[PDB]
Amino acid sequence: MDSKEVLVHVKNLEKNKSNDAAVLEILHVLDKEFVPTEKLLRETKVGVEVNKFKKSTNVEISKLVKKMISSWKAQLNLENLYFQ
C-alpha cells in the first residue's frame, strides 16, 4: 500500500466513524496490506489516526486498534535500530 491510498483510508476513518462495521473494514485493509515505515507513518499520520480509535465504544474495534498500533510500533523500532 502506497501513501496516496493510505491518505484515502485515513479520511475514510473520519467519515465513517459512526459506522462500526465500516470502520472495521477500513482497519482490516490497513492491518493486512499497510506496511509501516517511518516515512509512511510520518507523512500520512495513520498511526495517529488509527490510534484515536483505541477509545472506541466498540470492543472489537478497540482490540484490533491496540494490536495494530503495537505491531506498527514494534516494526518502527526494528527499522530505527537496524535499518536507519
> DSSP assignment of 12-72, as one string?
HHHHTTT-HHHHHHHHHHHHHH----HHHHHHH-HHHHHHGGGG-S-HHHHHHHHHHHHHH
Element (H, E) at 84: none
Q: What's the CATH code of the domain at 69?
A: 1.20.930.10
Task: Enter the resolution in angstroms.
Answer: 2.4
Q: What does the block give as the cell for 12?
A: 475514510
What's the structural domain count of the chain?
A: 1
Using DSSP's 3-state secondary structure scheme, residue 21 falls into helix
Range of the domain at 57: 3-83
8 Å CB contact between 23 and 16: yes
Q: What does the block give as the cell for 67?
A: 494490536
